[PDB]
Amino acid sequence: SQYSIQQSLGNASGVAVSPINADATLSTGVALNSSLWAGIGVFARGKPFTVLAVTESNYEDVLGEPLKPSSGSQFEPIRHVYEAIQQTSGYVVRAVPDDAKFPIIMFDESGEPAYSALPYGSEIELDSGEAFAIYVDDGDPCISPTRELTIETATADSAGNERFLLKLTQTTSLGV
């Protein structure tokens, strides 16, 4: 019967639940912004070499998962920002060396996909083939968890323009 509650949810007019998660963090609060701070830092996700306004509501994911302190001395910025967030917001700038590379997904004229990775700051262009391409520069390695896309053609508009739905998803190593 429809009274059963599913795990995967979409757009249909119904209410259900998402699968349980236990490896997650959360923190509530409203930034007072009496004093404002900013600085450089290295973080998971986030557009590097660009000022980013982060508050108590969004820093949890926009700053990404705090990095392991054993990995060099990169726990300094994450510790500092977590300390500072309980009082106000920040305008952090993320800096990465040339070793940082973002993925790029090229799409041919008939829709065939191709994978690549390029260092940040470098701009990619389209050759004679490979009709278009997409890329993420959000700073996420997309490896843990990984990021996937789904494409499904749908009905056209009044003008008859061919349309398709795109669905973004995040998949963990566990399988969530």
Partner: protein, 176 residues
Amino acid sequence: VTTLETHTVSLAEEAKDDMGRLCYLPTALEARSKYLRAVVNEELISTAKVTNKKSLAFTGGTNGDQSKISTAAYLRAVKVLNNAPYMYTAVLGLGCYDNAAITALGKICADRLIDGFFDVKPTLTYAEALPAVEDTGLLGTDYVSCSVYHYPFSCKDKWTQSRVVFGLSGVAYAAK
């Protein structure tokens, strides 16, 4: 010979009771009797006659061999359980050991976020009891709301005082 009930009814297409109750034959039969249903030809109801008959006993009907149980019946019953528009927070193995049925009920528990009370064959000694968990196929992170039971002992019947063996799944349910 013990009587159970008696009901008067009129063959009329528009038959009514003195209290206004519907005396239409199949309609009255379904309204009063919870044991007998009838089918009446619309082209022969007008010409149908009645008679005084005694000792009218059904013959030729029987359930057959109930020992033989089919996975098709199992899955049909599972479908009935799903489509049942009533709340139920717990399900039982209830003497069912078919692997396909167990898997189906496990999927039902998973997709309805309910509790399952599966049981395994009591005759399985601990040597083969351990692989039976894997043989279930419900091992995993999804089928965690359910439980699996075993009873490696013999008891005495309450009714026929016989050396019998049956699972403790219902007893555990009653206890919790």
